[PDB]
Nucleic acid binder design. Structure first.
Ligand SMILES: [Zn+2]
Ligand SMILES: [Zn+2]
Ligand SMILES: [Zn+2]
Ligand SMILES: [Zn+2]
Ligand SMILES: [Zn+2]
Ligand SMILES: [Zn+2]
Ligand SMILES: [Zn+2]
Ligand SMILES: [Zn+2]
Ligand SMILES: [Zn+2]
Ligand SMILES: [Zn+2]
Ligand SMILES: [Zn+2]
Ligand SMILES: [Zn+2]
Lengths: 51, 46, 51, 47
DNA sequence: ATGAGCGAGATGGAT
DNA sequence: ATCCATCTCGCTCAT
């Protein structure tokens, strides 16, 4: 299985209220968390709580 | 089959020659249509 | 009035291409200007020169 | 002068106060426009 | 009159 | 720093 694709959202100045919570974030889009990512001001709600 | 109303109500070059004309869109002529200043390139069949 | 604008007309996959840069939504055509410096595709702007 | 239709999908703080409003972009007021929730600061002079 | 569909522009993750 | 796929949202025009 390919390595978990890390994101870099919000690094640059963009709208900080949606960083990693829209379809441009590959993690958010794939229902993953940003564990291990290099995003800044991450607003990803996903926890990978697969239970 | 459609009878369009293009040009009745501006880009005069595209009248019945763009996706919003139901006849152009469907590869049809404007035979029987109510269009004004029709530019449909598909002529009524002789 | 500012220096003439730059457009990006025609980048979408539209088949409505007869009037690319030759209708009111092109800021160049609308202002009686050429597409000098633009990144439009399939440009039909009839203006060869600015102003 | 143009007649814009801004405000008639989201973000109303900036309607007619951003580069996509032909009036704001050209330093014109929205007097006579069809815009709605207009935030254009430019005011039309007195005739 | 009017609103669906259009399409040029803004955005910002990736580079 | 720009680039371009994706999204926004002002504009046109058949209805
Ligand atoms: Zn992200
Ligand atoms: Zn991430
Ligand atoms: Zn994140
Ligand atoms: Zn027609
Ligand atoms: Zn027709
Ligand atoms: Zn016709
Ligand atoms: Zn153009
Ligand atoms: Zn141009
Ligand atoms: Zn052009
Ligand atoms: Zn406006
Ligand atoms: Zn206005
Ligand atoms: Zn306004």
């Amino acid at each position: 299985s390919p390595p978990k694709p890390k994101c870099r959202c919000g690094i640059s100045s963009s709208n900080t209220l949606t960083t990693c919570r829209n379809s441009r974030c590959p993690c958010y889009k794939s229902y993953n968390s940003c564990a291990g990512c290099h995003c800044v001001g991450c607003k990803n709600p996903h926890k990978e709580d697969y239970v």
